[PDB]
């Protein structure tokens, strides 16, 4: 059936076996999404000019 | 690893991919909503140095990223593709490559939308992308193209997924599950797959018409040439009200499970409720012009479209009376999904009462394009669908990902969002009855009173989301230990008054559906031999 | 010329993936991955010229 | 039969405080911006 | 014929039942099931308290949804969440275009209200446009 | 359409006699108490005899807590406890109140 079942093996990201801390890529993956519209604001605010 | 998350055909992998896209785009949309409420805090330019066009691009990024990228891929994407085949015992969905492309079209829609926001300004149009504002003379540049392409891509995604859903629920049922004996969530996904397949192509026709009219020198909506921008409003809203009913029919299917399993008594009159769901599904196709009460219709279109939009109140009424009936006379276990479910039905009936107030075309001339309407739908979207989303996550994720959450953290998260979002969306009725118009970045200064309280409520709601995401982190790194301590709740149903605490251990789950009797996190191939049923 | 049994044999007698099981599944798919590679990276090399307003010259 | 005590005087002794508790929970639930108006400068406080 | 248990392994069972090394939970459930087979006037009332508690006590699966002493925890959590929401709101209000529009003071608003009574505004409700210091 | 109280108490009187293990009497009691009406004395007396037959004293403690929550007064409760005191002295089952006084 060729796909390994487990508890942490239903997700496309590692948690346990890891050199970096997991909270880094957790809050990073979510903070890039939170910082999408702020980057949108920075590019548009410089394009018309004021920031 | 690439064969399981990029070439995948199994429904659960695609479902959790749907879910992580949904929560990514959901906080990407609520960041826009926070910037909106910070611009609406005090009158005058506050954070955005003028630039009202940017306020419009943030408003519609918020709207599209909250509807087409959070609520749909979190309800019919995630919960749909996960818990439809396990609750009908199907070994997979029929058409699995369809399911995989129906996921992976969505990040490309997200990419097209945010590149639209970064070229000229973004679509500064309204989520209804009404011409002649959205055409070339008023919105130059390739932004509105990329927004139309993003909406094309989510149209492709949730049409192909709806075809996948309808054939795997008409063809892949188990040995005892006839149509009457379905769970009340698969009936919900059944009916929204119907409304999706019957509603998406008029939207696709309308927006590729708008694309050709911008880009191929046509005239369907340019009145300089003979078009009509009210043909677009018909072609949009014939999709648009079936869209706002498919944003809440799976929420109804979730809440009917939650209230049953925490009342510990079945839902009162189950097939009168599937009749009510089907009646709301049909009669939502006959009410589309109630968003068009002002455009200059007949007298008797606005007499018909006022009676037909209030016969909607009867099957929704009996759904809510049936919920309160099956909660009357039970053993209410005040867990986190039950709190979310009762707050759902209370705030949804508040949004429904203000919706029936809106539904009179005699009265909607005092309320159209005001903040009364934005109160009406943020009472049934952020309190209907979002509260059903939180109830569904807190109800199913200990089964799905296998790790429990901190329960008292979940209850402060619930109470924080229930306080703060009521605090933002309650004074919108006050501003709208005083005459405050919609979609404006700057208001007259007599509206500065009830806008400060609403931006405060949005800060409470966004910090409730930050608490929820810390709850996700604590679930994903300490849920195995949330089993071993009791910062969680483990058993969904308490023992009854006379059974005792070994008999309950031999009967540890008393459910009306297969989804909890599965292995936590379930097998890659559940149901090789089929689940027999009487 | 009714090759269906000779092709059923090798399409069940192989553990190569299905888009490789045929004999001539190199002549399709070695050019196809190159065409795909030059097809998806080239729209996104033009995006910083599109965000900053540089159009493509008529020369 | 009517064993002893009567049926909604036991239910009266039950649900007399539910009336006042309901009035408290709805008066807080719907009347929370009245305190904002009380502490507002629209009262010219 | 199984006679009664020791006193000093069942005195006050409903409070030390969960600090219990978990092997002897089994070898205290089974002999209570054995002792229940007698006539029910045989049993001393120390075990009838213990036999009720293993079946119907508020432990394990009959644990409450939240313990005794956490509605205080989540009331304090709700109130601190409201406090830190107010605080971060008031902090980010301190970076927003530091000048006020000229209408928002009492040197503009009573001239506005005199203009509204100058043009005879609403008699029923109020017209007084005063909200600022 | 639906069923008389007297036939109901003739149904659960048979169904309590037709029990064989501790799952079954704890199921038949839950099923008879989760109705609108509190059961008759002759039904709960078959319930007490059934819980005697399967050697469980905790459910025979729980029958009285169940009726005490089910009745509307405590005069009905004292009526019940005098309706079946002699069976509570034949079986010798204790009530929860005098074994756990507050
Ligand atoms: C899904 C629908 C949805 C939701 C939830 C919201 C929620 C919010 N919206 Fe609204 N909004 C719209 C859809 C929605 N909105 C639409 C369609 C318009 C019309 C646009 C137009 O007029 O053109 C609009 C317009 C609109 C206006 C009117 C201004 C205008 O018309 O220009 C405002 C102002 O207050 C606003 C702000 C907010 C805020 C502060 C929230 C807050 O409630 C945000 C807080 C929400 C959460 C914290 C939800 C939790 C987050 C998750 C990601 C869920 C995760 C759970 C799981 C994954 C299980 N949005
Ligand atoms: C979740 C999505 C959702 C749901 C469920 C609804 C539900 C309803 N809506 Fe709404 N609506 C929207 C999403 C939704 N709406 C959106 C997004 C907009 C703005 C679009 C835009 O951007 O322009 C909008 C705006 C909108 C308009 C257009 C006005 C305008 O735009 O200016 C109208 C007009 O009829 C309307 C009415 C109703 C009615 C009558 C219901 C009914 O279904 C409510 C039924 C519920 C009840 C009635 C309460 C429960 C029943 C009882 C307790 C029984 C007794 C009750 C009675 C007898 C009344 N709403
Ligand atoms: C942790 C620290 C918490 C406090 C940090 C802020 C301290 C402070 O002095 O607050 C100032 C705010 C002013 O907020 P404002 O009235 O919107 O003014 C914005 C400032 N400009 C842009 C004009 C320059 O004061 C305010 O008006 C905001 C106070 C909070 C408002 C809600 C209070 C609810 C109480 C219940
Ligand atoms: C755009 C709308 C396209 C919808 C196609 C509907 C097909 C209905 C059906 O009968 O679907 C049958 C197949 C399902 O393929 P599968 O691999 O899941 O089959 C599993 C069993 N062998 O559909 C397709 O091959 C769709 C092919 C899409 C090709 C790209 C289209 C891009 C546009
Ligand atoms: C039913 C809802 C009741 C909650 C209202 C609390 C208001 C607290 C407050 O803040 O009331 C403050 C306002 C101040 O307003 P003012 O300065 O114009 O009047 C100053 C002179 N009175 O008192 C009033 O308007 C009049 C007092 C009566 C209250 C009427 C409010 C009810 C109208 C609501 C209609 C729309 C309901 C929408 C429901 C979805
Ligand atoms: C908790 C639910 C309510 C949250 C928002 C309340 C504060 C909103 C606000 O900021 O109210 C500001 C008002 C007056 O505002 P102002 O005209 O002086 O504003 C000028 C610019 N700052 O005075 C208050 O501080 C009232 C605070 C107490 C509210 C209690 C509500 C019931 C609990
Ligand atoms: Ca402003
Ligand atoms: Cu509608």
Question: Residue-wise over D18-35: b if at least 16 C-beta within 10 A, else e?
Answer: eeeeeeeeeeeeeeebee
For B258-308, where are the E strands, in sequence order? Answer: none
D40 touches chain E (CB under 8 A): yes
- Which residue intervals of B119-185 are DSSP H helices? 143-171
DSSP secondary structure code for residue B385 in this structure: I
**Helix (H, G, I), strand (E, B), or coil: what is residue B370?**
strand
Those chains having 3 or more beta-carbon pairs within 8 angstroms of chain A are B
Residue B534 lies in a domain: no
Residue B209, CA distances (Å) to B130, B137, B148, B204, B285 in order: 12, 16, 10, 8, 22
Non-local (6+) Cβ contacts of C29 within 8 A are C19, C20
Q: Which residues of E touch B504 (CB under 8 A)?
A: 61
Pocket lining: B70 vs ligand 1, CB cutoff 6 Å? yes
Cβ-contact B134, B210 below 8 angstroms = yes
Q: Which protein residues are within 6 Å of ligand 6, measured from CB?
A: B 423, 452-453, 456; D 32, 35-36, 39-41; E 131
Contacts of residues E61-65 at CB distance under 8 Å and 24 or more positions apart, as own/partner, are E61/B490, E61/B491, E61/B494, E61/B495, E61/B501, E61/B504, E61/B505, E61/B508, E62/B494, E62/B495, E62/B501, E63/B486, E65/B333, E65/B334, E65/B335, E65/B407, E65/B489
Asked if residue B255 is part of any domain, the answer here is: yes
Pull the structure tokens for residue C39: 């097809």
Cβ contact B500:E55 at 8 Å: yes
Calculate the CA dihedral of residues E100, E101, E105, E108 and round it to 10 degrees. Answer: 160
For B437-493, give the secondary structure using H, E and C. ECCCCCCCHHHCHHHHHHHHHHHHHHHHHHHHHHHHHHHHHHHHHHHHCCCCCCCCC
Asked, for residue B517, whether it belongs to a domain, the answer is: no
Instruction: Using the mean position of ligand 6's atoms as its centre, give its distance from the Cα of residue D39 in Å.
Output: 7
Q: How many other CB atoms are there within 10 angstroms of residue E57's CB atom?
A: 18
Name residues whose C-beta falls within 8 Å of residue B486's C-beta, 6 or more positions apart in sequence.
E63, E67
Gap between the terminal Cα atoms of chain F: 46
Peptide bond between residue B132 and the one before it cis (omega within 30 degrees of 0): yes
User: Is residue B90 a contact partner of residue B168, using CB atoms and an 8 Å limit?
Assistant: yes
Name the packing angle between helices B231-246 and B249-263 (round to 10°): 20
Dist. CA C29–CA C35, nearest whole Å = 10
**Token digits for B345?**
């039905």
CB B39 within 8 A of CB B46: yes
Tell me if B206 sits within 8 A of B235, measured CB to CB: yes
* Contact call for B497 and F59, based on CB within 8 A: no
Query: Total domain count for chain F?
Result: 1
B197 lines ligand 4 (CB under 6 A): no
The whole-angstrom separation of Cα B106 and Cα B128 is: 20
Q: Which residue minimizes the CA distance to atom 23 of ligand 1?
A: B126
Token pair in block for residue B196:
């999706």
The size of the B-C interface in CB pairs under 8 A is 7
Structure tokens at A14: 């590692």
Pairwise CA distance, residues B427 & B440, whole Å: 16
Whole-angstrom distance, CA of residue B369 vs CA of residue B295: 12
CA of B37 to the centre of ligand 3 (A): 15
Q: Supply the range of the domain harboring residue F74.
A: 1-102
CA end-to-end distance (rounded Å), chain D = 64
Does residue B337 belong to any structural domain of this protein? yes
Q: Is any atom of ligand 2 closer than 6 Å to the C-beta of B249? A: no
Secondary structure of B37-96 in HEC code, one letter for each residue? HHHCCCCCCCCCCCCHHHHHHHHHHHHHHHHHHHHHHHHHHHHHHHHHHHHCCCCCCCCH
Which residue puts its alpha carbon closest to atom 12 of ligand 3? E90
Q: Helices B52-66 and B96-118: crossing angle, nearest 10°? A: 170
Cα B348 from Cα F26, distance rounded (Å) = 40
Distance E43 CA to ligand 5 centre (A): 68
| The two structure tokens encoding residue B68 | 């087409």
What's the number of domains chain A is made of?
1
Q: Is residue E125 lining ligand 5, measured as CB closer than 6 Å? A: yes
d(CA C8, CA C5): 5
CA dist D10 and D8 (Å) reads 5
What are the catalytic residues of B? 62, 92, 127, 157-158, 241, 243, 245, 256, 290-291, 316, 319, 438
Helices B11-39 and B449-484, interaxial angle, to 10°?
150
- Nearest to residue E10, comparing CAs of E42, E62, E54? E54
- Position B251 in a domain: yes
Q: How far apart are CA B419 and CA B417, in angstroms?
A: 5
Q: How far apart, in whole angstroms, are the C-alpha atoms of residue F44 and residue F31?
A: 12
Which experimental technique did the depositors report for determining this structure? cryo-EM
Contact B159, B200 (CB under 8 A): yes
F30 contacts in chain B (CB < 8 Å): 496-499
Expressed as residue numbers, the domain containing B503 is 1-507
Pick from B518, B509, B512, B519: which is nearest to B533 by CA? B512
D40's tokens: 């507002």
Rounded distance between C-alpha atoms, residue C17 and residue D18, angstroms? 69
CA distance F16 to B125: 71
Residue in C6, C9, C32, C34 with CA at minimum distance from that of residue C19:
C32
Tokens of B265: 């008594």
Cα–Cα dist B200/A21, whole Å: 43
Q: What is the CA radius of gyration of chain D?
A: 19
Task: Please list, residue by residue across B447-466, b when 16 or more beta carbons sit within 10 angstroms of its beta carbon and e when fewer do.
Answer: bbbbbbbbbbbbbbbbbbbb
The CATH number linked to F11 is 1.25.40.40
Residues B453 and B447: beta-carbon distance below 8 Å:
no
Name the residue among B525, B511, B26, B53 with its Cα closest to residue B257. Answer: B511
Burial class of residue C50 in the structure, from the number of CB atoms within 10 Å of its CB (0-12 exposed, 13-18 middle, 19+ buried): middle
Token pair recorded at residue F89: 């002295």
Torsions phi, psi for B49 (to 5 deg): -75, 80
Shortest distance, CA B116 to any CA of chain C (angstroms):
9
Give me the CATH number covering residue A49: 4.10.49.10
Residue located via tokens 């070339």: B136
Q: Are B428 and B375 in contact (CB under 8 A)?
A: yes
Query: In chain E, what is the greatest distance between 2 CA atoms, to the nearest angstrom?
Result: 103
Tell if the CB–CB gap between F30 and B500 is shorter than 8 Å.
Answer: no
> d(Cα A35, Cα A49) in Å, to the nearest integer?
20
Instruction: Report the alpha-carbon distance of residue B291 to residue B302 in Å, rounded.
Output: 11
- Given a contact cutoff of 8 angstroms between Cβ atoms, the answer to whether F29 and F66 are in contact is yes
Binding-site residues of B for Cu cation, in ranges, read 241, 290-291
Burial class (CB in 10 A: 0-12, 13-18, 19+), C55: exposed
Q: What is the CATH number of the domain that holds B370?
A: 1.20.210.10
Handedness of CA B213, B217, B219, B224 (dihedral sign): positive
The rounded distance, in Å, linking the Cα atoms of E11 and E129 is: 75
Number of domains present in the structure of chain C: 1
Determine the structural domain holding residue C32 and report its residue range. 1-59
Contact between residue B58 and residue B28 where contact means Cβ atoms under 8 Å apart: no
Structural domain that includes position A11: 1-51
Q: Which residues 6+ apart lie within 8 Å of E28 measured at CB?
A: E5, E9, E10, E13, E50, E54
Give the separation between CA B249 and CA B252, rounded to whole angstroms. 5
């Amino acid at each position: 059936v060729h796909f390994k079942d487990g508890v942490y093996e239903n997700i496309p990201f590692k948690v346990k076996g890891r050199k970096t801390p997991y909270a880094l890529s957790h809050f990073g993956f979510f903070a890039i999404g939170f910082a999408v519209p702020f980057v949108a604001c920075y590019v548009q605010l410089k394009k018309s000019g004021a920031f | 690893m690439v064969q399981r998350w990029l070439y995948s055909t199994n429904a659960k992998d695609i479902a959790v991919l749907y879910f992580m896209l949904a929560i990514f785009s959901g906080m990407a949309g609520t960041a826009m909503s926070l910037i909106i409420r910070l611009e609406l805090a005090a009158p005058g330019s506050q954070y955005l140095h003028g630039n009202s066009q940017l306020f419009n691009v943030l408003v519609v990024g918020h709207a599209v990223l909250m509807i087409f990228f959070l609520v749909m891929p979190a309800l019919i994407g995630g919960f749909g593709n996960y818990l439809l085949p396990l609750m009908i015992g199907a070994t997979d969905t029929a058409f699995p490559r369809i399911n995989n492309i129906a996921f992976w079209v969505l990040p490309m829609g997200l990419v097209c939308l945010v590149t639209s926001t970064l070229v000229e300004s973004g679509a500064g149009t309204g989520w209804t992308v009404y011409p002649p504002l959205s055409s070339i003379q008023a919105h130059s540049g390739p932004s509105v193209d990329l927004a139309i392409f993003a909406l094309h891509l989510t149209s492709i995604s949730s049409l192909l997924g709806a075809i996948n859903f309808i054939v795997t629920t008409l063809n892949m049922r188990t040995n005892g599950m006839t149509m009457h004996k379905l769970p009340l969530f698969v009936w919900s996904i059944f009916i929204t797959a119907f409304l999706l397949l019957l509603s998406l192509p008029v939207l696709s026709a309308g927006i590729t018409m708008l694309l050709l009219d911008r880009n191929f020198n046509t005239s369907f909506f340019e009145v300089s040439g003979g078009g009509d921008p009210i043909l677009y409003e018909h072609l949009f809203w014939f999709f648009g009200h079936p869209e706002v009913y498919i944003l809440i029919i799976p929420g109804f299917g979730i809440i009917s499970h939650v209230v049953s399993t925490y009342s510990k008594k079945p839902v009162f009159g189950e097939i009168s409720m599937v009749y009510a769901m089907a009646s709301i599904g049909l009669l939502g196709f006959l009410v589309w012009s109630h968003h068009m009460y002002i455009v200059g219709l007949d007298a008797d279109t606005r007499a018909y479209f006022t009676s037909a939009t209030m016969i909607i109140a009867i099957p929704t009424g009996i759904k809510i009376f049936s919920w309160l009936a099956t909660i009357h006379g039970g053993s209410i276990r005040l867990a986190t999904p039950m709190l979310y479910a009762i707050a759902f039905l209370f705030l949804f009936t508040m949004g429904g009462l203000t919706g029936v107030a809106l539904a009179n075309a005699s009265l909607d001339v005092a309320f159209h394009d005001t903040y009364y309407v934005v109160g009406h739908f943020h009472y049934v979207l952020s309190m209907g669908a979002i509260f059903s989303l939180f109830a569904g996550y807190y109800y199913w994720s200990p089964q799905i990902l296998g790790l429990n959450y901190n329960e008292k953290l979940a209850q402060i998260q619930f109470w924080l969002i229930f306080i703060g979002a009521n605090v933002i969306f309650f004074p919108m009725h006050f501003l709208g009855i005083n005459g405050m118009p919609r979609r404006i970045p700057d208001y007259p200064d007599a509206f500065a009173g009830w806008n400060y309280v609403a931006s405060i409520g949005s800060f409470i709601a966004t910090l409730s989301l930050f608490l929820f995401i810390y709850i996700l982190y604590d679930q994903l790194v300490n849920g195995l230990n949330n089993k071993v301590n009791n910062k969680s709740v483990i058993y969904n149903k308490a023992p009854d008054f006379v059974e005792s605490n070994t008999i309950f251990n031999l009967n540890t789950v008393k459910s009306s559906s297969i989804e909890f009797l599965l292995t936590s996190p379930p097998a890659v191939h559940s149901f090789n031999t089929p689940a027999v049923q009487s | 010329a009714n090759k269906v049994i000779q092709l059923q044999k090798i399409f069940q007698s192989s553990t190569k993936p299905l888009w490789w099981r045929h004999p001539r599944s190199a002549l399709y798919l070695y050019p196809f991955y190159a065409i795909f590679a030059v097809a998806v990276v080239t729209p996104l090399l033009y995006i910083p010229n599109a965000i900053r307003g540089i159009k493509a010259k008529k020369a | 039969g009517r064993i002893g005590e009567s049926w909604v005087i036991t239910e009266g002794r039950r649900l007399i405080p539910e009336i006042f508790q309901w009035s408290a929970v709805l008066s807080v639930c719907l009347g929370w911006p009245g305190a904002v108006y009380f502490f507002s400068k629209a009262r010219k406080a | 014929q199984t006679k009664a248990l020791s006193k000093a392994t069942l005195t006050d069972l409903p409070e030390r039942w969960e600090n219990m090394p978990n092997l002897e939970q089994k070898e205290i459930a089974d002999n209570l099931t054995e002792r229940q087979k007698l006539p029910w006037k045989t049993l001393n009332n120390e075990e009838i308290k213990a036999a009720w508690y293993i079946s119907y006590g508020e432990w394990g699966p009959r644990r409450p949804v939240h313990g005794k002493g956490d509605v205080a925890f989540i009331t304090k959590g709700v109130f601190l969440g409201l406090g830190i929401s107010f605080g971060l709101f008031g902090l980010v209000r301190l970076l927003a275009n530091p000048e006020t529009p000229k209408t928002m003071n009492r040197e503009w608003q009573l001239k506005s209200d005199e203009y509204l009574k100058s043009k005879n505004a609403n008699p029923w409700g109020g017209y007084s446009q005063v909200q600022s210091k | 359409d639906e069923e008389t109280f007297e036939e109901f108490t003739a149904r659960y009187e048979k169904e309590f006699d037709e029990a064989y293990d501790l799952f079954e009497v704890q199921r038949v009691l839950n099923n008879c108490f989760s109705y609108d009406l509190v059961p008759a004395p002759a039904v709960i007396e078959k319930a007490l005899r059934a819980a005697r037959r399967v050697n469980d004293l905790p459910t025979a403690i729980r029958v009285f807590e169940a009726l005490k929550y089910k009745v509307e007064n405590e005069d009905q409760y004292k009526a019940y406890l005098d309706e079946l005191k002699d069976v509570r002295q034949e079986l010798g089952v204790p009530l929860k109140e005098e074994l756990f006084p507050s």
